[PDB]
Structure 1
Amino acid sequence: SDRVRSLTLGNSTITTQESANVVVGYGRWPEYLRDDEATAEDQPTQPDVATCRFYTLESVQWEKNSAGWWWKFPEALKDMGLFGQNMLYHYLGRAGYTIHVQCNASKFHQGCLLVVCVPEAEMGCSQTDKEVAAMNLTKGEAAHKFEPTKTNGEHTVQSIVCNAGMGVGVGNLTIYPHQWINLRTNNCATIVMPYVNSVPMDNMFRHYNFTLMVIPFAPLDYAAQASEYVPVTVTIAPMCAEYNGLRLAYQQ
């Protein structure tokens, strides 16, 4: 049975009895930087099991009127164990990441989520005449959510779902590494993202390599007396984490 699967990274292990295979980035699997592609001359540090493990973020509640959510990495993991510590003390970073979104219900509930990883998910502002604030793009492990209607915020992100806050069609986000969580068949979604960037390495605070978006295309629904609380938890584990440029920790 390919339904059941097990994931093991570091001192963490995830279990599943209702998965749907595993999407591996753009056909590639996380790998350390090679010598014929490196730029930083200093010998990198590789904490390995210390940083490459499963980090669970704050759960989110899926409601009949939920429009979606989104996280930005590696920023969202700035306060996660040693992975966040290396981000502070190092100028350059490089990691893989294994996204694992969980969400279970019952054979009597219905709904369908879209777990996607969007590289360089540059987003727009609510007020097209102004700019956006980092605080409105990503706020730690705290998820930002999409709205079923237009936003008005000064420096807020245009959370209107239909445009995914990028000025595009949500139905075309399938062009990015993704999976769906169709409650009647699924229970979770896993995506192994390889380091994608136009540079061997990059800062992890200044640059948001990719954005994880969970947009429901099939509204959550159910009958009376059926558990109304359906949470959606996101777990991610860095892979082949390398760091360069060691210096005094950065004051957030």
Structure 2
Amino acid sequence: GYSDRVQQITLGNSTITTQEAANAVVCYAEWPEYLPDVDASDVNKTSKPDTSVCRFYTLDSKTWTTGSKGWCWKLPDALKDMGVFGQNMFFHSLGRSGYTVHVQCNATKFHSGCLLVVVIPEHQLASHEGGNVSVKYTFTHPGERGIDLSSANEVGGPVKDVLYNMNGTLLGNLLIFPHQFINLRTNNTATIVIPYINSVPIDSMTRHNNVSLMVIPIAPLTVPTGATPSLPITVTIAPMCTEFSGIRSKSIVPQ
């Protein structure tokens, strides 16, 4: 009586149940694991807070309306302030982590709409100015708020044009990245497990984000007659196999 459909994920002191899942994706078919010695470089023993950092943090909720263009969060940024995960983050020189991402959106059998939930490794954004204008730090570190693709261009911020993925590629091809759809008629959640993907064994958690999670409405939300025209979307994310190394004074970052 197991269905692909019902699932339970327990991680730390927190549990999620979905009764309307559509399997789960594990990026590149690899599950998060700690850093092996053969791959290690820094000689420091690392710190593995385990259950105090590897639990589920639910970010603040978004509201899908007929005019929504899509939202974008960066990792580990989105979690920069969650509990002890965040403290560890500002206090060590280097850290490394994988995540379980669970995006939630329920409706009824009269609604229609379909969101794309995708994880993009190394999502370098484009400046809407063109040329070689850079995208300032603050703009690519929105924190739990994430970036709202239907917000206005700002100065020093990225471009927010959806048919171009914020980088000069077409929305249609985002499907080459680990992703899952939430089609109100099928699905009510999306779950993706992200292994740590980098060109170095461990890195800085503040100067470099290693994935952007993106939720994009593709088939517009259509509510039943005289229904309220909107649904909330909630994102809950859990660091998994986290390791921190090179402890010290506590980083100070712009803004």
TM-score normalized with structure 1 length: 0.96
- Counterpart for residue 52 of structure 1: 54
- Counterpart for residue 142 of structure 1: 145
Offset of 1:76 from its aligned partner? 1.3
- Structure 1 unaligned runs (5+)? none
Match of 1:97 among 96, 99, 103: 99
Supply the AA of the counterpart residue of 1:98.
T
- Counterpart for residue 193 of structure 1: 194
**125-134 or 14-23, which deviates more:** 125-134
- Counterpart for residue 170 of structure 1: 171
Q: May I ask how many residue pairs the two structures share in their alignment?
A: 250
Does structure 1 conserve the Cα–Cα contact (< 8 Å) formed by 2:153 and 2:160? no
Q: Pick closer, same or farther for the CA change 1:160–1:45 going to 2, 3 Å.
A: same
Which secondary structure does the structure 2 equivalent of 1:85 belong to?
Answer: helix
Supply the AA of the counterpart residue of 2:167.
M
Offset of 1:152 from its aligned partner? 4.5
Rounded Cα–Cα distance in structure 2 between residues aligned with 1:16 and 1:62: 20
- Counterpart for residue 88 of structure 1: 90
Rounded Cα–Cα distance in structure 1 between residues aligned with 2:252 and 2:218: 40
Does structure 2 conserve the Cα–Cα contact (< 8 Å) formed by 1:96 and 1:238? yes
| Alignment RMSD (CA, Å) | 1.3
Offset of 1:155 from its aligned partner? 1.4
Offset of 1:138 from its aligned partner? 2.6
Structure 1 runs (4+) deviating above 6 angstroms are none
Does residue 24 of structure 2 align to residue 22 of structure 1?
yes
Rounded Cα–Cα distance in structure 1 between residues aligned with 2:146 and 2:66: 18
- Counterpart for residue 209 of structure 1: 210
Offset of 1:223 from its aligned partner? 2.9
Which secondary structure does the structure 1 equivalent of 2:39 belong to?
Answer: coil
Does structure 2 conserve the Cα–Cα contact (< 8 Å) formed by 1:57 and 1:141? yes
- Counterpart for residue 219 of structure 2: 218
Does structure 2 conserve the Cα–Cα contact (< 8 Å) formed by 1:127 and 1:153? no
- Counterpart for residue 230 of structure 1: 231
Does structure 1 conserve the Cα–Cα contact (< 8 Å) formed by 2:12 and 2:52? yes
- Counterpart for residue 162 of structure 2: 161
Offset of 1:145 from its aligned partner? 1.4
Offset of 1:147 from its aligned partner? 3.3
- Counterpart for residue 124 of structure 1: 126
Taking only the aligned residue pairs, the percentage that are identical comes to: 54
